[PDB]
Design an enzyme around this catalytic site. Structure first.
Site, short mmCIF file in Angstrom:
data_model
loop_
_atom_site.label_atom_id
_atom_site.label_comp_id
_atom_site.label_asym_id
_atom_site.label_seq_id
_atom_site.Cartn_x
_atom_site.Cartn_y
_atom_site.Cartn_z
N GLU A 70 0.79 -34.09 36.77
CA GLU A 70 0.64 -33.40 35.50
C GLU A 70 -0.68 -33.74 34.83
O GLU A 70 -1.38 -32.85 34.35
CB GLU A 70 1.77 -33.76 34.55
CG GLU A 70 3.12 -33.13 34.89
CD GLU A 70 3.15 -31.62 34.67
OE1 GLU A 70 2.20 -31.08 34.06
OE2 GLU A 70 4.12 -30.96 35.10
N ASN B 42 -2.17 -23.13 27.50
CA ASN B 42 -1.34 -22.18 28.23
C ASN B 42 -1.70 -20.79 27.74
O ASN B 42 -2.24 -20.65 26.64
CB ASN B 42 0.14 -22.48 27.99
CG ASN B 42 0.52 -23.90 28.39
OD1 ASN B 42 1.15 -24.63 27.63
ND2 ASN B 42 0.14 -24.29 29.59
N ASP C 290 0.17 -18.43 26.59
CA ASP C 290 0.88 -18.05 25.38
C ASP C 290 0.27 -18.71 24.14
O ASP C 290 0.78 -18.52 23.03
CB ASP C 290 2.37 -18.37 25.49
CG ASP C 290 2.65 -19.85 25.62
OD1 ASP C 290 1.70 -20.64 25.72
OD2 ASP C 290 3.82 -20.23 25.63
N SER D 162 0.11 -22.02 23.57
CA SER D 162 0.59 -23.38 23.38
C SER D 162 -0.34 -24.28 24.20
O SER D 162 -1.17 -23.80 24.97
CB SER D 162 2.02 -23.50 23.88
OG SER D 162 2.07 -23.26 25.27
N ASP E 50 -0.48 -28.19 26.43
CA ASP E 50 0.25 -29.31 27.02
C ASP E 50 -0.57 -30.55 26.72
O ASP E 50 -1.79 -30.53 26.85
CB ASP E 50 0.38 -29.13 28.52
CG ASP E 50 1.26 -27.97 28.88
OD1 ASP E 50 2.08 -27.55 28.06
OD2 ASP E 50 1.13 -27.46 30.01
N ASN F 270 4.61 -29.83 26.13
CA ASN F 270 4.24 -28.56 25.51
C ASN F 270 4.47 -28.42 24.00
O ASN F 270 5.55 -28.74 23.48
CB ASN F 270 4.92 -27.44 26.31
CG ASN F 270 4.45 -26.09 25.89
OD1 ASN F 270 5.12 -25.43 25.11
ND2 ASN F 270 3.31 -25.66 26.39
#
Ligand code: CL
Ligand code: NA
Length: 129
Positions: free
Chosen positions: A35, A46, A48, A50, A52, A59
């Site tokens: 990750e 991301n 959308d 958002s 991370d 998120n």
């Protein structure tokens, strides 16, 4: 902070992640590796909108507040910036809520695609825990 493999394993173990919700330590270390490459400061946006954050790429759509993800929840009740600290406590505490959410570690795409069903014990091999 960029953790060493065993250094992270030890920190996670100390924070109660070994076997948390039935997931052995190797799963958590493997998830962190893929990750964030063990970097607490990792961030990724991301599509959308958002973002991370941190070692476990938590998120902002659901778990932390970054002030720029309209209509997002803050289920862990923390600013996303807290997830970038060299101290993994916030990341671990929030991760515990996520993994208890119902889908287990499948919530982490890299874990599902790169750790799930593999020999995860290898991630902690050689470490003094
Ligand atoms: Cl599960
Ligand atoms: Na949020």
């Amino acid at each position: 902070k960029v953790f060493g493999r065993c250094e992270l394993a030890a920190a996670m173990k100390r924070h109660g992640l070994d076997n948390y919700r039935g997931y052995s330590l190797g799963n958590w270390v493997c998830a962190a590796k893929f990750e964030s490459n063990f970097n607490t400061q990792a961030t990724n946006r991301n599509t959308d909108g958002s973002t991370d954050y941190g070692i476990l790429q938590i998120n902002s759509r659901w778990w932390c507040n970054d002030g720029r993800t309209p209509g997002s929840r803050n289920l862990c009740n923390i600013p996303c910036s807290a997830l970038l600290s060299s101290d993994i406590t916030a990341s671990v505490n929030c991760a515990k809520k996520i993994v208890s959410d119902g889908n287990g570690m499948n919530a982490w795409v890299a874990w599902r695609n790169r750790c799930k069903g593999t020999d995860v014990q290898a991630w902690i091999r050689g470490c003094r825990l």
